[PDB]
Amino acid sequence: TQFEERHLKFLQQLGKGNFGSVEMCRYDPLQDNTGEVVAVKKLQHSTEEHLRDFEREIEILKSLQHDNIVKYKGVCYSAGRRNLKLIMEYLPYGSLRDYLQKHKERIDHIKLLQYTSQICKGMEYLGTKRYIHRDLATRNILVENENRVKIGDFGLTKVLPQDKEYYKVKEPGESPIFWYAPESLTESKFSVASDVWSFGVVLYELFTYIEKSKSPPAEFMRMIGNDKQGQMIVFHLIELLKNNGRLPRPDGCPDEIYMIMTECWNNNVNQRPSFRDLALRVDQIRDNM
Ligand SMILES: CC(C)(Nc1nc(-c2c[nH]c3ncc(Cl)cc23)ncc1F)C(=O)NCC(F)(F)F
């Protein structure tokens, strides 16, 4: 079934980035304001390269059906082929980052692990399709309700080549470097293993309860020196990672959860755990607790 542009009523801006913008809209064909509230993504500056990447993100999202992956709803073509709109489910609790920042320690360790398990499961399913998320962070995870989180924003997702286990980005855009694996920093190489490294960073964010002074950019900047600027930050971060500088164990975090983070943060790509293993391990910790 099709979505008519004339029936998409603007409600609120949700955000912007990666050459796109996301708005909360009511899909109201009955024109009585009883329509479903949806999330609508469109391109801000729509070049032929941007259209091509947007179409690929649409195909990727439409191919994914999992409880812990944001639902594709459709496409609106009313403005023509060159001005597509991606329609997705709207998750009113917003990002896990905002949700956790608000609700802090009132969300216990058992609950953080329920979210951790769901993130692993969504990521494992993503990996079976040979898709590399490339932007795993609490800011890119949505809360559906108290018991369910879902991976969102597939705007940076790459499909692995048929004959290779990594995707090489020739001309990188804005990069979340404090979530990046060393091979992604040095060679712009992305794989299931680099998504596992970013997952270790997600687990860290969770157990610091999004405390501002404890964030991966704040911790890494203190380790390299706050006087470092521009490309010198990347140069120093690479050398720090090479010499085993890592994020600290968050205050009150169980030893066992810190060990999972440190295994994800292995410089050897082949030694990092698998998402299938992580979900099994995290479910065992949950059960024990
Ligand atoms: C608005 C913003 C910067 N970007 C996007 N949101 C949604 C999106 C899809 N459904 C949503 N429902 C609620 C909210 Cl707050 C956002 C969305 N889908 C794609 C995006 F690029 C965002 O919130 N990102 C967090 C993420 F969704 F990725 F987890």
From Swiss-Prot:
Organism: Homo sapiens (Human)
Active site residues of this protein: 135
Parent-record interval covered: 842 to 1130 of 1132
Description of post-translational modifications: Autophosphorylated, leading to regulate its activity. Autophosphorylation on Tyr-27, Tyr-125 and Tyr-131 in response to growth hormone (GH) are required for maximal kinase activity. Also phosphorylated by TEC. Phosphorylated on tyrosine residues in response to interferon gamma signaling. Phosphorylated on tyrosine residues in response to a signaling cascade that is activated by increased cellular retinol. Undergoes Notch-induced ubiquitination and subsequent proteasomal degradation which is mediated by ASB1 or ASB2, the substrate-recognition components of probable ECS E3 ubiquitin-protein ligase complexes.
Tissue specificity remark: Ubiquitously expressed throughout most tissues.
This protein's domain notes: Possesses 2 protein kinase domains. The second one probably contains the catalytic domain, while the presence of slight differences suggest a different role for protein kinase 1.
Protein name in the entry: Tyrosine-protein kinase JAK2
Complex and partners: Interacts with EPOR, LYN, SIRPA, SH2B1 and TEC. Interacts with IL23R. Interacts with SKB1. Interacts with STAM2. Interacts with IFNGR2 (via intracellular domain). Interacts with LEPR (Isoform B). Interacts with HSP90AB1; promotes functional activation in a heat shock-dependent manner. Interacts with STRA6. Interacts with RHEX; this interaction occurs in a erythropoietin (EPO)-dependent manner. Interacts with ASB2; the interaction targets JAK2 for Notch-induced proteasomal degradation. Interacts with MPL/TPOR.
Residue ranges of coiled coil: none
Residues at which ATP binds: 14-22, 41
Function noted in UniProt: Non-receptor tyrosine kinase involved in various processes such as cell growth, development, differentiation or histone modifications. Mediates essential signaling events in both innate and adaptive immunity. In the cytoplasm, plays a pivotal role in signal transduction via its association with type I receptors such as growth hormone (GHR), prolactin (PRLR), leptin (LEPR), erythropoietin (EPOR), thrombopoietin receptor (MPL/TPOR); or type II receptors including IFN-alpha, IFN-beta, IFN-gamma and multiple interleukins.
Domain Protein kinase: 8-283
Family: Belongs to the protein kinase superfamily. Tyr protein kinase family. JAK subfamily.
Higher taxonomy: Eukaryota, Metazoa, Chordata, Craniata, Vertebrata
Location of the protein in the cell: Endomembrane system; Cytoplasm; Nucleus
Disease: Chromosomal aberrations involving JAK2 are found in both chronic and acute forms of eosinophilic, lymphoblastic and myeloid leukemia. Translocation t(8;9)(p22;p24) with PCM1 links the protein kinase domain of JAK2 to the major portion of PCM1. Translocation t(9;12)(p24;p13) with ETV6. Budd-Chiari syndrome: A syndrome caused by obstruction of hepatic venous outflow involving either the hepatic veins or the terminal segment of the inferior vena cava. Obstructions are generally caused by thrombosis and lead to hepatic congestion and ischemic necrosis. Clinical manifestations observed in the majority of patients include hepatomegaly, right upper quadrant pain and abdominal ascites.
